[PDB]
Amino acid sequence: LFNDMEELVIEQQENVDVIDKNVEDAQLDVEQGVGHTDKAVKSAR
Amino acid sequence: SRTAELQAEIDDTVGIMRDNINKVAERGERLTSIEDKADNLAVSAQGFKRGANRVRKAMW
Amino acid sequence: IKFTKQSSVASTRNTLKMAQDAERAGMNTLGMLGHQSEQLNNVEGNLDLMKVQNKVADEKVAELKKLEMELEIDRNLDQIQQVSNRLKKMALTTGKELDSQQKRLNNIEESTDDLDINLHMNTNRLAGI
Amino acid sequence: MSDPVELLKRAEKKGVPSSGFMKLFSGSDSYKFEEAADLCVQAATIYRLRKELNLAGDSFLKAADYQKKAGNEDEAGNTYVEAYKCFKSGGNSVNAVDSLENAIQIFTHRGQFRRGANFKFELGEILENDLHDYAKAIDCYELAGEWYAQDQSVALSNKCFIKCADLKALDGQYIEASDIYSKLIKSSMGNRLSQWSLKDYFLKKGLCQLAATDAVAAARTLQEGQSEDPNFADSRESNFLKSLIDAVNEGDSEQLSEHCKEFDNFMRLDKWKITILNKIKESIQQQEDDLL
Amino acid sequence: MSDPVELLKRAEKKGVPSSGFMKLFSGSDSYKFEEAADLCVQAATIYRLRKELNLAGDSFLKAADYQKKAGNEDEAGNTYVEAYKCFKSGGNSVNAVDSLENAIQIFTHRGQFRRGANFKFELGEILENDLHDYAKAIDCYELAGEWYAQDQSVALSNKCFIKCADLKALDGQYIEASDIYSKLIKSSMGNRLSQWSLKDYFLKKGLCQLAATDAVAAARTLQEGQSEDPNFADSRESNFLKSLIDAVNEGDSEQLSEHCKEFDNFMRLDKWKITILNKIKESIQQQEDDLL
């Protein structure tokens, strides 16, 4: 049962890698987007 | 009496760690769902960036 | 009598071996769970920053629209007991750490879903401006 | 709530492409297919709320078809995955298979090998368990493992290749199963985390080689494992495989069955090992029957 | 599907900046590089679909360079990660290293020390296994662990420090490796999850200091382990370290050989410890050479 637990954690490593990478990209993309809306508000005024 | 105590301790760890197996199965299901939703989140963030950029160009 | 003792010695040898190997399995599992805990801490931080950025996005979009054999048996049992104690501590440990990470992963799930919905809303609003 | 039948009828009406003279005055038909898809999605949601799951799957399939006609292939793949979820929860394995095939095609064409591997794996599961189409399941698991290997997913690759090797060995393809086990072994060397699978791996390889009557191959596999993995050298699996090789070389099926019982008492033989071991016994018995 | 070579040629024609008179009438070159990058990415996804990974990685590198020229540094880093993916899956470790270097520089330049540290660790692993660049991999691990300490990630820094000290000790640099083991001891002290790691650390530090002919240093390392860490006090590692210290105090290489044998008897020894202990024995032999 140790072994099965440990193998399930093997599989879950990639889940953790993908969540970190994807949430990072999402955060960065939203930062760029909020910058873009800030510039849009600046121009519209 | 020592060997019996060792046997009891091992049985208890077996029980604790079967519960651990069930918990890590639940954790794996949760992590799969979170992976799917974070792929969704990244796609949505890119779309929001692009739409905000297009609006920025529009008002300029 | 001698044969039975030899069988006991061999069995205690196997028990000690594969017990030690179980110790290893749990150990690397725990180091690995701590690694993934750190990664999930990063995920949580990014989600928090993203919530703040979506508040800013909400307000900006709103304005944008507005605009010898016995002895060996004994010693092998000694070693097995030591390892087994360490194994029990590890099992109680992994149960606890999985519990905390399970609540954390739940909250991560709802936070990601909420951020996704908010971003889709803001993108739909920006499409009409 | 709207009637899903009326939503589907309106979706069908809107989904008719512009033909003839009207094509000179009508804009891109993309837009029309987009609302046909939206109407189909609404009907699918209403069916899903009613637990009329197969109908929801059908509506999602129609929505995905219209999305494909609009050029929105990514949305089409997502909707095929939704149609899949509806069919799988509905017990309609055939339409579930069709949905994943379409979805995986869309995903692979878009360079999303990760998602395509996930769904190819799930498709293989439906083929193994629900439809019992083992051959194309083997194909699914092999290809998913290849896609995972390209992504440097050693682990998901290995899960797929375990399943592929097991199904191949059960189907009489012992040599190819042994070769997949060789690949899996080579991938699991040196990784502290996988050594337990590694012992198992060596055993299975030898067993296939005994089912192919190539006892020399079993011997070299066992020697290899003894040398390259100390944990396997001293393991019950190595000793058991030594013992099976010895029984096979002797032509003593009873000794093999005794060894199987002994190994069973200490480590339960799962169904797969029982099948392969029975095959090995049968090959022995057939050889005596010819020698008699 | 389009021919990827034609896409690359179109990108290359499109990769030429405006020079001279038409620069006065042509807009910013950013759009133009954007088009070239899109073409290269499309060609590279096609290459990836045909399993021609090296060409896909090269096209990723070209697209990343063009995007750097366009000012989209983050997309260039992502494309460098893709080039890494296809190069390492393609077996070209040197080009994967180049992609990792460019990506790490990009990520550090944008304040993403986290990505920098992760990919520095991947880079060091690739160097240790494929290219046997031990010194530069040591630097990679040290820098990764340092940036991880800057990121407050205890576990990542701890792991990177373990491999960093491992490589440093095996390469003759005992004092610095023991110093990193002291850092590992201090960072891991008081944590119940890293207890076992500590149990190993004290021993490793003592071993390294003993390979440096500083017997008093291994003695203080052992005494620190016994007094500070209760579990290590009763651990076989502490007893092995005292017995190593005693044997080298006596200069009895035979006794040392014996203690290696008993330590192997219950806990199979790892190549790191074998190399260090062989170096200690050979130091007894160099001492023997001095002894005349």
Author numbering:
A (entry chain K): 213 to 257
B (entry chain J): 27 to 86
C (entry chain L): 433 to 499, 589 to 650
D (entry chain H), E (entry chain G): 1 to 292
Reproduce text from the manuscript describing this model.
The disassembly requires multiple ATP hydrolysis events in the presence of Mg2+; as few as six ATP hydrolysis events are sufficient. The side-loading and side-release mechanism explains how Sec18/NSF can disassemble SNAREs with constrained topologies.
We prepared the y20S complex in a nonhydrolyzing condition and, after single-particle cryo-EM data collection and processing, we obtained 381,591 high-quality particles that yielded eight three-dimensional (3D) classes into which models were built. Indeed, the electrostatic potential surface of the Habc domain forms a roughly opposite that of the bottom of the D2 surface against which it packs. This structural observation is consistent with XL-MS data showing a crosslink between the Habc and the D2 domain of Sec18.
